[PDB]
């Protein structure tokens, strides 16, 4: 049998976040830590809620020391703060790094066994539900909001680790477009193609079934639809976006990504990389290593992306397919090599090996092995 | 904004019933009413699952008392059954009768005030959560497991009356085709129908959006194909039904229905007609009156339903649409006739009057008049 962990509760939307005050006096909780990192503060898209709970008059207090690609530091020290704060529940605003840190606050607050963080890695063993999580992402990309999964840096061992835990899904999710409109162009794009990377890798994962795949291929339509429009500024491509960001979170968490995945992390853990331009230098280069070993569901890929497959054979459609990704990252503005984001040739042999282990990697379609990972990080590399 | 309302937790497949014990063990239950009717128990379908149970040690009680389209009375009594019981927590082994008698249990038994039962009609004001509910669906059918909605008989009244409470969610669904394989092929064929009548009604009812619009679409699609297959007992055609059905809930408990389900609700409450032979014989009626109100919707039915709508305008899509509903529903020996299910003419009236007080007749994408529900019911009665 197929497991799906969803959101009981989520509400979709521009003004979506209009209702977290009503849901949280429905559910009797008293303070909000609000996880959250120092632009989204800055930027005013803090306030937007915290505006609406001050009205409500509900308490809250914050914690923005998160940064892109959480580390240990930054949980411990986010758990402290939720400590000497009184908060009864979590209110994570932000992308991927703000709610992936929230729901290992969550977790290691009613698992305090899990304290040292690194010990969360795979299927977290945890007897208790996280504290209660309300999820409102800013980036229209990681669905951290609806996954089960959440990613942190060992900075000790320099590596991103995932952890699984259907103890971790938040209660509530706000989808709310008027949260991410500030997005730069370029994090529109990044965080667009770590979405179509979700949907993509998720449609073809091993544990593929009949509902993950109706899912994801609505989220690759919805997606390569909408990503141009958002970045250019669209405000109903944003909305849109917004959506197929989160239908793409409502398969892969529940079946799995791939290589892609397994060699992003590697490249956030050894440059910083943001997550969503790894995955989009990387994601057209797997989709031709995997290809032979993902029956006709190319076909549909290229078809939702906008290209005629009408009279086209397996092989052609699979290359129409890698073509229009290629396509997609060129109009957005995401250079075609690792080399151009700073990944060194050295860094290969370690990097392929950290891609070995990555718990994403299991979901690939193909088996791959170190002398694959090595030669597609080369292929990526450089013309 | 657009809230969903979904399963926090679900399991899909032949065997799902299997993570029934580990589920009750991770949430630290220590006893079930299984809320259900003879005729599952009598089938053995609910030895299915207590087999499971008594193999982990987990107790329980049951209440068979349920009848099909549940009335006040059957409510009461499942209660007092639950309050002797000693029960935390309730597993509905059945179709939408005793699932819908199991939310009205969960709901009452946390909300006291509620014990006369008709004051739950319409947005029920409850301030807590059902009882737990592990929800088992053993017809191809209601999507009881996922919606929000129930349905209760007053007998005094003479109707039907919709109960819409989030408080009643399910907190796992185990959606199995094994305990579904046992309906007689004319019971496959109602609850098939009235699965494809929730997804056509949502695909067009006035709150439908893009996520519940993906839903109902893939719904009808699965359901079209799937239903001949399920009734002349193909395995895989009964699992693909199986998750058609559950698909069709996850949109239309969160967007509503319309004026067949309003039409239908009558015809439960005048003469116990079973729901789906009920919205089998008006859907494709009700269809044809809706149809001018759809803008393209009919086109994408047709088309997934198997139609080349390739060459076709907007109203030879539309019939198209109407015929490939009519062409099942006799393929899978539904009377296509109110008349050959002892609906009496002399009632229409007041049939028509129920059908426009009812509240699934509000997102009807039509805004019907009584003489429009007279004259269909008219058209859907005679030879
Ligand atoms: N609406 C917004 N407007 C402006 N800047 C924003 C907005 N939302 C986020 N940012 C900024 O974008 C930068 C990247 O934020 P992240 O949360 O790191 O981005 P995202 O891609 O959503 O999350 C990536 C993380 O999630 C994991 O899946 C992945 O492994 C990685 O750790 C940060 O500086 C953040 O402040
Ligand atoms: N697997 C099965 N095998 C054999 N008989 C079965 C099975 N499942 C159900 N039945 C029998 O089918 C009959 C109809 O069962 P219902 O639960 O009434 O059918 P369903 O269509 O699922 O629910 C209808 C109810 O749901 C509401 O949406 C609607 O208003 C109505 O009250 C009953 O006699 C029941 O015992
Ligand atoms: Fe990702
Ligand atoms: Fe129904």
């Not at 559910?27 to 709970?53: F, N, P, S, W």
Request: proline content about 5%; glycine content about 10%.
């Amino acid at each position: 049998a197929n497991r799906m962990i969803l959101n009981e509760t989520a509400w979709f939307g521009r003004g979506a976040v209009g209702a977290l005050t009503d849901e949280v006096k429905r559910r009797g909780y008293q303070k909000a830590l609000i996880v959250t990192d120092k632009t989204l503060v800055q930027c005013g898209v803090v306030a937007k809620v915290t505006d609406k709970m001050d009205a409500a008059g509900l308490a809250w207090a914050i914690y923005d020391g998160v940064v892109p690609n959480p580390t240990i530091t930054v949980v411990k020290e986010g758990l402290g703060v939720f400590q000497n704060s009184g908060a009864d529940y979590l209110i994570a605003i932000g992308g991927g790094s703000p709610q992936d840190t929230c729901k290992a606050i969550g977790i290691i607050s009613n698992n305090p066994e899990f304290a040292d963080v690194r010990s969360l890695e795979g299927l977290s063993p945890t007897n208790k539900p996280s504290v209660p999580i309300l999820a409102i992402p800013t980036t229209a990309g990681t669905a951290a909001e609806v996954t089960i999964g959440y990613v942190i840096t060992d900075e000790e061992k320099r590596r991103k680790f995932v952890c699984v835990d259907p103890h971790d899904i938040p209660q509530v999710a706000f989808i709310d477009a008027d949260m991410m409109d500030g997005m730069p162009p370029a994090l529109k794009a990044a965080t667009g193609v770590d979405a179509l990377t979700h949907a993509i890798e998720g449609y073809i994962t091993r544990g593929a079934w009949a509902l993950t795949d109706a899912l994801h291929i609505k989220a690759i339509e919805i997606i390569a639809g909408a990503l141009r429009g958002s970045v250019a500024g669209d405000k109903d491509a944003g909305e849109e976006m917004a959506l197929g960001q989160y239908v793409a979170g409502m398969g892969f968490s529940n079946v799995g990504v791939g290589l892609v995945h397994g060699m992003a992390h590697p490249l956030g853990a050894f440059y910083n990389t943001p997550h969503g331009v790894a995955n989009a230098i990387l994601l057209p280069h797997v989709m031709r290593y995997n290809a032979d070993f993902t029956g006709e569901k190319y076909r549909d890929i290229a078809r939702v992306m906008g290209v005629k497959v009408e009279g086209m054979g397996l092989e052609e459609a699979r290359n129409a397919a890698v073509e229009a990704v290629f396509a997609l990252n060129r109009d957005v503005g995401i250079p075609p090599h690792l080399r151009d984001v700073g990944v060194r040739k050295e860094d290969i042999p370690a990097l392929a090996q950290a891609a070995l282990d990555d718990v994403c990697t299991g979901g690939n379609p193909r088996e791959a092995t170190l002398e694959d990972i090595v030669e597609l990080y080369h292929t990526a590399w450089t013309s």
